[PDB]
Design a binder for this molecule. Structure first.
Ligand SMILES: [Zn+2]
Lengths: 1135, 349
């Protein structure tokens, strides 16, 4: 009855395991990267990674290891799902069609058994004769590997050791033996077993059990030349081979605990290690003891290769390249320069893969431009937490790429008779001007006779009367079309260097000092048309034709624009575009179906104006903060009619339908200059030069989420937007180490120790307190901060540091009571390690004005403040279990008004209108209504169920959305039409779904246009959510008929589209929980419905062999096989 | 009694109709033995029939005895059953242990005299670890901690537990909530809190007198600690281990008034006035106490502290001594070193 529709907008980006091997071919070195439900296959090249395929599996990738059984050339791929789905994939490409076929599949889940707290472990026999799996305590599941085992039939083997940490398969053994470390009451031990498939049980191990340190956690199987296992904990690294026993206690690995490893040598002579912090060690195996052929060890020295990202799964590619995956940071490709020793850090970064990471809290902001609301997340954690800004920016498809040394301008040029195309591109260096004739993909450059070799030419285009005049600093050189030789050269009257030169269809304008000279274009000749001297320096000028009806003049020292006749100097109109800085460029075209003009300056704002045809100058004063660097204006023919391109530090395209111009983003980090070019290979294309290189191509759909990162070097927790002050308020936490001299020292310079203005909260509203257990040396204290970040520059304007033991939890920007000021409000809580439940909390009200964060009110409460909201000018807070509402008095002091006592912890608060939704981690959804007449709270409904909720959200007055345990989603509903009190006082759980992610935060708003569309949209509303992995979903409501149609379409598609591993979709989306499992209802999968636009036409014809297409009233049972495509496209347009 | 070796386990969420003896009208939490003695011939026949059939019985936890209406109850399996023929009256002695809790869907009375009701076995569900959803795959190997070193010398054991909520809840930084909030929902951390607090009420050996299973531990503490009937019904409502433990702490921190044992009606002191400046519980102030004897300071472990015998007003039992300063410039002047086991805290209403 919920009738919802959940669709992802961004794919998960957190790498949870990567591995290399020959998968696509017997010669390549493939790299496969699992991201959660997405499998990515790359081919490792000399210069980096070349993407090959992006395949989506119906499940959570929990185990991924490659094996090559005898009789095959390319490795297979055993992938296990967190829902216990096992498959053996194999790459299969036929020329151009690529499919991931499944050799064998099955389900390895047992009927009864508690999953191990150490999680699923999947290991493979080195000889590829068995697969070991640890799914439940004291049960080792063995999967025999045979050609006829298409069903993957496994059998259990009993482990007498209940607590087993890590299991691995040893190398170079006759029978398949396993080595593992297990916890027993005596301590920690390492034990070896021998697996017998015929006996279907264990036997005596190769070498007897030993004793390891109390922390020894992970085991590494050394290959055949050495033989044995290596066990590493935090204090010691040991090597066991039966009669051989080596051990070290290096002081380098003491600081952190090694969690991930990799082997870089085929014979296992060197290994890579990665700890929590992100320092990359390197274990070396010394093979100098070849006494009598046996390659035994001599020492176990450990090296340090320098700090890297927070490593979760290392992967050593060839040619000394390491892929350092990261679950909460950015995935990296580093290089082991083992010889360099820059500062002791051998590793140097080569690439970086973006990662939205653990989105902790997000906000949806509306920085002008109408709709297109930006989305700001507090991504990352520890030393790489950052803010990510996400938009909907059109992507640029570059058909070719050519490197340029930062060209100061590119113009088209024809090296042939005029064929309405340009086969030569003329660049402009700092002082030189290199021109290359590129009909196709040519790169050779040869200067022509008509163009000077080095003259710093600015404008070089096709002049009229079969000629071409290039204006240079020294003089303008004119070259005819067919002769291609110099015919005239009309230098400056003062022989000065023209700072700005304008080339038109038949007029050439040169600005020398404060004077200007316009010359009409004559056939193979130069003739002056007018000469004048402006009042001030000419900032910029342009002519927009044959004869330009009007011309523009800019003031460099005054920032004043004037309009004068092109062949004369008669002033027409004047205007001032703010006067902050001198304009950089100006232009005028028919982008908005009218002769609109624009002027761009070096403040990153553009001033628009409305110009008539013959003589008309309007104001149209509007400045938009497009960018943060100086711009450049250009017009590209590959558009609707002309449009306009503004290259900046965020490139923007001026798109207008009939009367509204929008600066749509362009998916590029930075664009320096761009110019249209009709190349023979790519006619009507655009050549854009960036700050480092240049590209040539076109544009595409808006289907792109451009992501800009702003590092903070500390963990960000909460964020809100303040429109009045135009700044973000974000909490952050830096982990600084206690010092023995008295005080604490920061580990690294974060965004709170590098701010403009900093303050320390000295408002000690309370005294005394206790701490008998003194803060010992080496302890790490988490110090909190409130940062006031800008919105278009992203610099920390203010950084307010709270008290000692001040864990700030909530943060809300709102204006309370009748006050006109917008106040920052933070609800903190004192936590001491001695006390369990905090007793003292604070509500502090900051007011960021004039660049200073002054405190207005500091309220003390008996408890902790978990979440805070606003009621039309009242502040509702949740002190521990109570729910308090605060009235803002005229004397700037919070005054309590009413209290509601909940037996649960009021942890999640989500309100709309007068209804209040309260919940806690145990998933106890409670409803409240504030009655203004009585001025007190009332309890409307309840829903109590033991489970781990993660986030809750309001969808409507009746429907309440929320995630819960095992990555599931539920929707509760209240039936106000219920006859009895009990029926309407209990929430009915109507919707269930299995998203596959741990949802952290819910929010309203959408990233797409807010266009009403007259007759509204098929989907009512939009709710975004961000998860731990990094995806961004979108839950929107639907009608009953649309829900039925989409449900039947999904059921029909489930029997047509094949899935890797042959996993049934209904089982994948089933509501999964340790205690019970029920099929999904009330939710429509978005990805599956969107996947209707890529399959082949016969598949569509099979899927659409029924239904009603437009409506049941019109029948249309055939449905024409295309109305459903239109419906799917209209659904896809929501994101 | 008759030795019983079989184990009865009714299926969860399965409806069943069973008879309930009317003599018992109290709430019997699971895991608590409820011995009785039936004398009526109808009760003896019903007990014999139950023992031969399934050795099970029902006990509906009535909110009000007079109304005889119960929304929930507990099923009891007869661990020991005996028959006695004395004084010409047959006596059936049953020592049963509660096994499951059921909600009485329908109530009915049989013609024989007993009342047979149909109830559904409520599911006492168990929740997994709160970090199982968000645990990093690479960090799984570091979650099996290093045993549980317990010693009275460590006392608070502050260092070890500070390392628990740093290796068990490392992954809390991936979620919007802090580790100290998750530590309020940790089953073992909760059992930690009840255990140390209960050592402030008694001299029991908590090492073996208390279980390690959260579900079994939660049941007996709810039975052991003294509360009213309505509170006992309230805890019986919860079907989860963690929520039941959470309710227990609230029914265990909202009992401040240190009333006497034996008395169970007079108020000795309050937990607010605890003279922790310098076993025994020291209270800076006290009321409703009678001091007798002489200020004998011999062997007084507390120096400048002379003590005298004490009594409540009527209980007349020794509950401690009001230490008195032996010097003019000595603070506090009078502190009562009452015995921990001599007081039973109750809700300060
Ligand atoms: Zn007494």
């Amino acid at each position: 009855m919920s009738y919802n529709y959940v669709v992802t907008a961004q794919k998960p980006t957190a790498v949870n395991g990567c591995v290399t091997g020959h998968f696509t071919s017997a010669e390549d070195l493939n790299l496969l990267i699992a991201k959660n439900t997405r499998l990515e296959i790359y081919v490792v090249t000399a210069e980096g990674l070349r993407p090959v395929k992006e395949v989506g599996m119906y499940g959570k990738i929990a185990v991924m290891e490659l094996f090559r059984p005898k009789g095959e050339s390319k490795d297979l791929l055993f992938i296990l799902t967190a829902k216990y789905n096992a498959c053996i994939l194999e790459y299969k490409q036929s020329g151009e069609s690529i499919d991931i076929i499944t050799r064998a599949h099955g389900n390895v889940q047992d009927r009864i058994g508690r999953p191990s707290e150490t999680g699923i472990i999947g290991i493979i026999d080195p000889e590829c004769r068995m697969i070991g799996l640890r799914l439940y305590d004291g049960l080792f599941k063995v999967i025999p590997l045979d050609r006829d085992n298409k069903e993957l039939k496994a059998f259990n083997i009993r482990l007498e050791e209940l607590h087993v940490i890590d299991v691995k398969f040893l190398y170079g053994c006759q029978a398949p033996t396993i080595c593992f470390v297990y916890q027993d009451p005596q301590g920690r031990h390492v034990k070896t077993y021998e697996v017998s498939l015929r006996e279907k049980e264990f036997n005596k191990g190769p070498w007897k059990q030993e004793n390891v340190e109390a922390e020894a956690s992970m085991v590494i199987a050394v290959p055949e030349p050495f033989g044995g296992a290596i066990i590493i904990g935090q204090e010691s690294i040991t090597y066991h081979n039966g009669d051989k026993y080596l051990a070290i206690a290096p002081p380098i690995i003491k600081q952190s605990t090694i969690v991930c490893h990799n082997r870089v040598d085929p014979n296992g002579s060197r290994y890579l290690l990665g700890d929590m912090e992100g320092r990359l060690f390197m274990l070396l195996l010394e093979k100098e003891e070849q006494m009598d052929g046996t390659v035994t060890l001599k020492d176990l020295r450990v090296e340090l290769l320098g700090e890297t990202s927070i490593a979760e799964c290392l992967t050593y590619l060839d040619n000394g390249v390491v892929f350092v995956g990261s679950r909460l940071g950015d995935s990296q490709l580093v290089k082991l320069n083992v010889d360099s020793n820059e500062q002791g850090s051998y590793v140097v970064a080569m690439e970086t893969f973006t990662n939205l990471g653990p989105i902790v809290d997000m906000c949806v902001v509306d920085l002008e431009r109408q709709g297109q609301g930006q989305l700001v997340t507090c991504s990352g954690a520890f030393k790489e937490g950052s803010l990510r800004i996400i938009r909907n920016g059109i992507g640029i498809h570059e058909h070719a790429s050519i490197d340029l040394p930062g060209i100061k301008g590119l113009w088209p040029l024809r090296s042939d008779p005029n064929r309405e195309t340009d086969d030569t591109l003329v660049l402009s260096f700092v002082g030189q001007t290199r021109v290359l004739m590129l009909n196709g993909e040519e790169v050779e450059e040869t200067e022509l006779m008509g163009f000077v070799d080095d003259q710093q030419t600015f404008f070089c285009g096709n002049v009229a009367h079969q000629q071409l005049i290039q204006i240079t600093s020294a003089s303008v050189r004119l070259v005819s079309q067919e002769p291609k030789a110099l015919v005239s050269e009309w230098k400056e009257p003062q022989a000065k260097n023209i700072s700005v030169a304008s080339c038109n269809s038949s007029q050439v304008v040169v600005a020398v000092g404060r004077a200007l000279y316009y010359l009409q274009i004559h056939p193979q000749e130069l003739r002056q048309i007018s000469h004048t001297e402006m009042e001030h320096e000419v900032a910029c000028l342009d002519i927009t034709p044959g004869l330009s009806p009007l011309c523009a003049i800019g003031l460099w020292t005054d920032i004043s624009a004037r309009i004068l006749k092109l062949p004369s100097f008669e002033l027409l109109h004047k205007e001032m575009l703010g006067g902050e800085i001198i304009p950089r460029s100006i232009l005028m075209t028919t982008f908005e179906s009218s002769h609109y003009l624009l002027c761009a300056l070096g403040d990153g704002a553009l001033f628009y104006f409305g110009l008539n045809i013959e003589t008309g100058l309007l104001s149209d004063r509007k400045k938009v903060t497009l960018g943060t660097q100086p711009t450049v204006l250009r017009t590209f023919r590959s558009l609707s009619t002309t449009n306009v391109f503004a290259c900046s530090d965020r490139p923007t395209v001026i798109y207008s339908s009939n009367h509204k111009l929008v600066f749509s983003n362009v998916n590029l980090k930075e664009v320096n200059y761009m110019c249209p070019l009709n190349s023979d290979g790519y006619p009507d294309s655009l050549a854009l030069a960036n700050n480092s290189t240049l590209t040539i191509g076109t544009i595409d759909e808006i289907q792109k989420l451009h992501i800009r990162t702003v590092p903070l070097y500390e963990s960000p927790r909460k964020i809100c937007y303040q429109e009045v002050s135009q700044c973000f308020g974000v909490l952050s936490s830096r982990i600084e180490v206690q010092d023995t001299s008295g005080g604490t020292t920061a580990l690294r310079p974060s965004a709170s120790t590098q701010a403009l203005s900093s303050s320390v909260s000295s408002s000690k509203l309370f005294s005394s307190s206790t701490a008998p257990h003194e803060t010992s040396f080496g302890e790490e204290v988490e110090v909190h901060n409130l940062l006031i970040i800008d919105q278009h520059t992203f610099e920390v304007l203010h950084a307010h540091q709270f008290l000692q033991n001040e864990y700030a939890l909530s943060l809300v920007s709102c204006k309370l009571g009748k006050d006109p000021n917008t106040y920052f409000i933070v609800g903190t809580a004192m936590v001491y390690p001695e006390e369990a439940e905090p007793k003292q909390g604070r509500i502090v009200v900051f007011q960021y004005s004039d660049g200073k964060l002054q405190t207005v009110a500091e309220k003390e409460v008996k408890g902790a403040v978990y979440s805070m909201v606003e009621f039309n000018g009242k502040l509702l807070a949740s002190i521990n279990s109570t729910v308090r509402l605060y009235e803002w008095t005229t004397e700037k002091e919070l005054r309590t008004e009413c209290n509601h006592y909940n037996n649960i912890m009021a942890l999640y608060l989500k309100t709309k209108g007068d209804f209040i939704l309260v919940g806690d981690l145990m998933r106890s959804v409670l409803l409240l209504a504030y009655k203004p007449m009585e001025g007190n709270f009332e309890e409307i409904a309840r829903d109590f169920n033991p489970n781990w909720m993660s986030a809750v959200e309001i969808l409507d007055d009746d429907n309440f959305l929320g995630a819960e345990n095992a990555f599931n989603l539920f929707v509760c509903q209240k039936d106000s039409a219920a006859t009895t009190d009990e029926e309407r006082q209990h929430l009915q759980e109507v919707g269930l779904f299995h998203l596959g992610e741990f949802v952290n935060v819910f929010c309203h708003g959408s990233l797409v246009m807010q266009n009403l569309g007259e007759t509204s949209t098929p989907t009512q509303g939009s709710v975004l959510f961000g998860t731990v992995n990094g995806m961004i979903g979108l839950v929107t409501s639907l009608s009953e008929s649309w829900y039925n149609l989409l449900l039947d379409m999904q059921n029909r598609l489930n029997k047509v589209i094949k899935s890797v591993g042959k996993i049934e979709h209904s089982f994948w989306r089933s509501f999964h929980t340790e205690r019970k499992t029920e099929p999904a209802t009330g939710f429509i999968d978005g990805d599956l419905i969107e996947s209707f636009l890529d399959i082949s036409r016969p598949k569509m014809q099979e899927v659409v062999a029924n239904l009603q297409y437009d409506d049941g009233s019109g029948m249309k049972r055939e449905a024409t096989a295309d109305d459903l495509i239109k419906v799917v496209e209209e659904l896809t347009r929501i994101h | 009694m008759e030795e019983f070796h079989g184990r009865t386990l009714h299926d969860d969420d399965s409806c069943q109709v069973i008879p309930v003896l009317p003599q018992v009208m109290m709430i019997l939490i699971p895991g608590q033995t409820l011995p009785l003695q039936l004398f009526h011939p109808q009760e003896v026949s019903m007990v014999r029939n139950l023992i031969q059939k399934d050795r099970t019985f029902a006990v509906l936890a009535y909110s009000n005895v007079q109304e005889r209406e119960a929304q929930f109850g507990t099923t009891a399996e007869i661990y020991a059953y005996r028959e006695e023929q004395d004084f010409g009256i047959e006596i059936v002695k049953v020592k049963a242990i509660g096994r499951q809790r059921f909600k009485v869907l329908e109530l009915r009375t049989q013609s024989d005299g007993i009342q047979q009701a149909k109830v559904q076995i409520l599911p006492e569900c168990v929740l997994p670890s709160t970090m199982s959803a968000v645990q990093l795959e690479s960090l799984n190997k570091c979650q099996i901690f290093p045993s549980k070193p317990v010693s009275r010398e460590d006392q608070c054991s502050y260092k070890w537990w500070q390392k628990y909520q740093k290796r068990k809840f490392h992954c809390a930084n991936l979620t919007s909530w802090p580790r100290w909030l998750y530590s309020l929902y940790d089953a073992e951390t909760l059992m930690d809190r009840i255990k140390k607090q209960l050592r402030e009420w008694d001299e029991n050996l908590k090492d073996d007198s208390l279980p390690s299973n959260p579900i079994d531990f939660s049941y007996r503490v709810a039975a052991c600690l003294p509360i009213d009937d309505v509170l006992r019904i309230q805890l019986l409502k919860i079907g989860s281990a963690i929520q039941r433990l959470r309710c227990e702490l609230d029914i265990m921190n909202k009992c401040t008034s240190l009333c006497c044992k034996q008395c169970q009606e007079t108020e000795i002191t309050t937990k607010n006035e605890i003279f922790s400046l310098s076993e025994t519980l020291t209270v800076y102030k006290a009321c409703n106490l009678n001091l007798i004897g002489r200020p004998s300071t011999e062997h007084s472990w507390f120096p400048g502290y002379a003590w005298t015998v004490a009594q409540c007003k009527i209980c007349a039992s020794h509950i401690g001594w009001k230490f008195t300063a032996t010097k003019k410039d000595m603070s506090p002047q009078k502190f009562w070193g009452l015995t921990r086991s001599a007081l039973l805290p109750t809700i300060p209403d």
